[model samples]
Target: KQIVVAGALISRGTLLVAQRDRPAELAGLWELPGGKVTPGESDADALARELREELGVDVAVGERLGADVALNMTLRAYRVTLRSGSPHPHDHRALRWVGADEIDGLAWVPADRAWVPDLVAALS
Candidate 1:
């Protein structure tokens, strides 16, 4: 089984979210930005690399956010801090920095949606 990593990057009480761009069914939905973990990469490393690739930003990966979710494989979220560069939607259709109140209204990927409570708590 493979492990998937996601970054719960927050700044100024807002969490950065990206909209999906592919797979017709999933496109237009929002999710924490990340990608699959590859061999030789730790969970933190995988998340950092994914953010650099997907959003072109450098981040300091931190503690785990919530329980591991069983998606196609394993989906894990972690706290992260932006270190450099502004977040730009390279792989996503768009990007938004959502506050806890705004998080609920967006259609999220099912797996990522599970972290809403934790995310809102963190935001508040």
Candidate 2:
């Protein structure tokens, strides 16, 4: 059993979501722009790095959106700001700023779906 923690970055009253296009393990599933926190790397730092790498943008990290549970997976969510660059999905097939109404339309990763209510509540 392994635990993989990820952070969801939200901005402009929407969640910054990316389509996974690699490693076959995560393909086609929508996910937040952050990645795993490596050793010695803070969660915020890892989030910044992942956002930059995945979206080609810089962002200001904000308050946490708390944690979520989906089956066997767990994830943390966060609010963020678009500090620099446009969100162009560099490593994904597509990127979008999704609001609550449009959230159910995306093919969300199983774990990510668990956080939608909280995300929607925050935006509202």
Candidate 3:
């Protein structure tokens, strides 16, 4: 499977999480912000585009957060710095900024849940 990129966008002791709004079964579950990497698009470029489209903001894509997890396919998580504009739920149902202690409380999208420990570590 191809690499799907997820952003572990952390800011002010919180990790940004987005709620899925579609695909019926996945609706209402939260996940890190990101989508599939387009053919010929670099990982960083994909992250930037996804964040812009989904978060409605510009961001600085940073280091990888953890190993890839299999969703519809495989996804790689990365740290992102929100560089401008407050985020809104452009494509998702909602958005949340969760601290380390809040990770366990989220109904994360199955594949994105695999990175909780790493996401918590980033917030911690």
Which number leads on lDDT? 1
- Model 3's alpha-carbon lDDT is 0.88
lDDT of 1: 0.93
Lowest-scoring 10 consecutive residues by lDDT in candidate 3? 66-75
lDDT of 2 by residue, 1-124 (tens): 2224454566666777889887687798897767666777766787788788878888877787757454453456677777899889788888888788877777887777777777678757
Off by over 4 Å in 2: 1-7, 68-74
**C-alpha lDDT (0 to 100) for residue 53 of candidate 2:** 86
lDDT of 1 by residue, 42-107 (tens): 998999999999999999999999999998689999999999999999999999999989988889
lDDT of 2 at 6: 53
- Scored against the true structure, residue 20 in model 3 reaches a CA lDDT of 96
Q: How far is candidate 3 from the true structure (C-alpha RMSD, Å)?
A: 1.1
Q: What is the Cα-based TM-score of model 1?
A: 0.97
Best first by lDDT, ranked: 1, 3, 2
